[PDB]
Amino acid sequence: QSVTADPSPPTNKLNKYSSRITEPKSQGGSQAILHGVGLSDDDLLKPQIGISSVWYEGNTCNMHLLKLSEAVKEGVENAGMVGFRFNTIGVSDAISMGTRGMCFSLQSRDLIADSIETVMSAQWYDGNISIPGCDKNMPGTIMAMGRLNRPGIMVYGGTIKPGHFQDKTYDIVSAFQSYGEFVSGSISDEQRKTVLHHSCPGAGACGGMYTANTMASAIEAMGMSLPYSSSIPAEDPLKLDECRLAGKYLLELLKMDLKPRDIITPKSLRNAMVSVMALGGSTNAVLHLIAIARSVGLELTLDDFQKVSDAVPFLADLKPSGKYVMEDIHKIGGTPAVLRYLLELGLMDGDCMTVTGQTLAQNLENVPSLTEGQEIIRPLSNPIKETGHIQILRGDLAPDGSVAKITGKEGLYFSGPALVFEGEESMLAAISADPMSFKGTVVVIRGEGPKGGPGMPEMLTPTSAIMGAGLGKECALLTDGRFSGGSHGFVVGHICPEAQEGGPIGLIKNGDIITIDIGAARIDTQVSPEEMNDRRKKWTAPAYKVNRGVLYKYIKNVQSASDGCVTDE
Amino acid sequence: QSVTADPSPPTNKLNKYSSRITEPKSQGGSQAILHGVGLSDDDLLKPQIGISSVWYEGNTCNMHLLKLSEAVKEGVENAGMVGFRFNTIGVSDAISMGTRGMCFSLQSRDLIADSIETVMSAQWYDGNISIPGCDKNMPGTIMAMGRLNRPGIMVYGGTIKPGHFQDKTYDIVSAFQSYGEFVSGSISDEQRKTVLHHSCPGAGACGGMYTANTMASAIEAMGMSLPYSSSIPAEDPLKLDECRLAGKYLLELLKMDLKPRDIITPKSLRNAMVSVMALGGSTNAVLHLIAIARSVGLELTLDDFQKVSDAVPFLADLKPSGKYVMEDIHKIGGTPAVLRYLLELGLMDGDCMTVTGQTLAQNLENVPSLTEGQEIIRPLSNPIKETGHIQILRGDLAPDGSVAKITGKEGLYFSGPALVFEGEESMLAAISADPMSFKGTVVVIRGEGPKGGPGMPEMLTPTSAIMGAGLGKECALLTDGRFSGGSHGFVVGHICPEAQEGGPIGLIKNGDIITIDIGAARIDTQVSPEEMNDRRKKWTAPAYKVNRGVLYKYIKNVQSASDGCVTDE
């Protein structure tokens, strides 16, 4: 697509954009401000780099990013350019999980994209270095780089180290776990609060192969982060060095005029998808990689994910599904070692250009390969699963698609009477009052989509409640929103069209026999198509849950989950 | 209106919102993050204050706000609460003026509103202290406070001091001036660059009674800033003290549960409008005060502004129209002294509650009144103008309203043949190639509205070019966008419906006789209504100038200029 969003520059000038305001005499007001913020006349000739961090104090994943941003600015100066720091908002899923605050989480990705686009466009910056540390902030920064198509590098803030107390290990999942184990009698109240004091020991995104580590890995695999960016821990001295080197690398990109639309291509998008399948990455990567592909005017469908999934085995023993964390990947050679193996297996395209100014194959040719004897990355011979964990389903009830994490452990079928809830709250109430009424059913939590939630919130408590009731393999779980963790059975999100839009999920009634077939990739109903259409003819959309503010704007702008919930089309 | 946007709290608890995540055991994940960012168990009991600054390095108005935010956080802690800093984006009109970057400026107000709303909602903060320093950021922060309706205080970053070099004085307007004076032969190239090195000497919003000082004054008059917030200079030691005291005042507001919808009322909105008229404030205050009124579920029309204008004289000798700057107001008693006089004149409502926990009259009862012999604030006896500078016009060509700054100096009428331009660029080209073709005409610059610009950009060069061509009193100027400065004649912006929407402004043709009548408050055309309707029947909307990114979303969401360009309705 021919994306029209942001200003074009006024051939090998390095200040292609800022010359708009630093050179013409008709822009004397611009130059006066720049002198006032401390630029000399000689500084006016230099490229201006927008340094967009996502620092804030109320989240471990973000509280350290200001220090990183100072390192990035110093490196930009040490490279002969002018560095201008600015900062946008972010929100913490770990804080807001379980609450209505979670309705504000997904859209913060698109707010951040808008934020950085706005500043780069208004201030005429020549290039960008972004420092996210957290979930939705990674893809938000890439989307703004794609819209602007000015040279850019994403510096991942880095993952948090695991927590340790008396030879037992924790992360944020342990803290999520602790309340269920408390009411379960599994642990006492004193054990439960030791969990919460010792779960997150410092700065960083959440420790496992969760959304943050998935996206940072995928973005590195996409060539838009420097090698090792995704795997160096947040608190590591080498993270600061990477910050200080981004300026040098960005200078080279301005010299080459190597732009994000030269780096983010169908093939580098595939490389990113390969990393997701190989590492067992989050199903949220489906939403974010589609948004990222759209931002550079490319197409990316649910079916493209199925094809890559089928072509790529699950190889990594990493939480949540497995046992290791991102720090362990760091210790055995980092993300470049992992990608080196995948490239040697012929699974990746090595000719894609990256922010090093070289191709992926040139980056990976001379990096230490995986540590001899490591048990995290299985060989192609003995994979954890022969194909990817990510599965697309499209039955009667998800005609426009849906997304599931499938281990190959759950069997190929589940059939049961539907048990329908209009939100997370009523589902949890019902399973507390009456767990046995759930045995054998297909639990449907609807009204949680992009418009219905609103905000397509991530829900963790339904899968926790089902496990703690002992129903993990004895029920299935469907939503137009998103589930956070796994059952030991069938769990499907992103069901499209969402219930708010009158998709078949909004027409289900209690007792309807729903059949999930993994092999046919279908979520079907025993209800006849004509009775479903009768239900459709009689359906009226429920009133929106908001009429003002950022979430009403989201409702007005957001596309379906199958379209990556983009908001600017 | 019954605004539904943001979460409701789970009677005299001070942590009405954060208890949602600090108290229930089912929110152990939340508490683990909070322990990791450094909260003790005792800290968990305290109120959590979101401290939203708009710091960034590429603008003199914003580069210092991080230091202010540290002072605010210390004061919040010294008051027994937990302070969590976060930061959003802003853009600089002084940098981007004259460029397509200016299309991103107005919408940044609404992006900021969305930004702060998002974080307060996701993180469950109990109250907010906002630190803007710049144009669109002031009203953006109030709008988020109104949506949330949690106790909040806006701390103005403060105005910049004027520049000084060899017993001559400058501000950003001097830098804007300098290029026109250069091509004019008025000044040399060396004099022109002395202007630009000595125009903005440090931190702060632009020095005159421009948008920033208008809005900060109006917001103080509205009771949503502490007394003197608007008039203390950015670099003043007392600004840091105000920062350090906001925590104490916010604590009292939580104790009283005095919320923004208890403070922003029809009467405090009128108080804010009174300050605008009395001080000669920017016509942008029309857009921002309407947006602010909408954010608390109130109504505010163009006609309400006309009524207050008629009821309130223009009293202040302040640039751009006059001679003094905000620092001078500071030296003669500040904004509270000005408001004290206006309250003594019976022009303001003294019973409105404010963020001090007291009413306006209680705040102003014991502040030093204006300095004896000051010549900035004229007496009611001898006003600069008997009524307000701000005028609403609604002829054939602006049926839904338009806004003009009228001094009472220009006469009551202008009639001339229309000279129509589809954008700022073609207007400036035409006036350079052929200035005399402009003599006696009504210059129409259309396609610059909220959707057409897009972004309703502010235009400075048309009024500069007209003055430098010697045509200041010999032509008139109309737009669906915004003009920055004054002619010495008739200059109208915000014309509604905008041309992009097929309003009569989009149907004007060269030669059409346009008559501006200030007394009747009408912009009329000699063209017959039936010929205008014929033109309308044949009109087709031009294609949007963008199809992606934040500005396309703006086009999709923004209401008319007459509706304050709100985006969330």
Ligand SMILES: C#CCN1C(=O)[C@](O)(C(=O)O)Oc2cc(F)ccc21
């Ligand atoms: C980044 C990160 C952590 N991450 C979270 O923190 C969570 O809240 C969770 O509970 O796993 O949401 C998630 C959902 C998902 F598919 C993958 C990861 C996460």
Ligand SMILES: C#CCN1C(=O)[C@](O)(C(=O)O)Oc2cc(F)ccc21
């Ligand atoms: C704040 C501020 C300064 N301010 C500007 O800086 C300007 O760019 C200008 O030239 O006056 O835009 C403006 C337009 C207006 F109506 C009032 C003020 C401004």
Ligand code: FES
């Ligand atoms: S909450 Fe920030 S990475 Fe999970």
Ligand code: FES
């Ligand atoms: S540009 Fe910031 S106040 Fe004028």
Ligand SMILES: [Mg+2]
């Ligand atoms: Mg998450």
Ligand SMILES: [Mg+2]
């Ligand atoms: Mg301005």
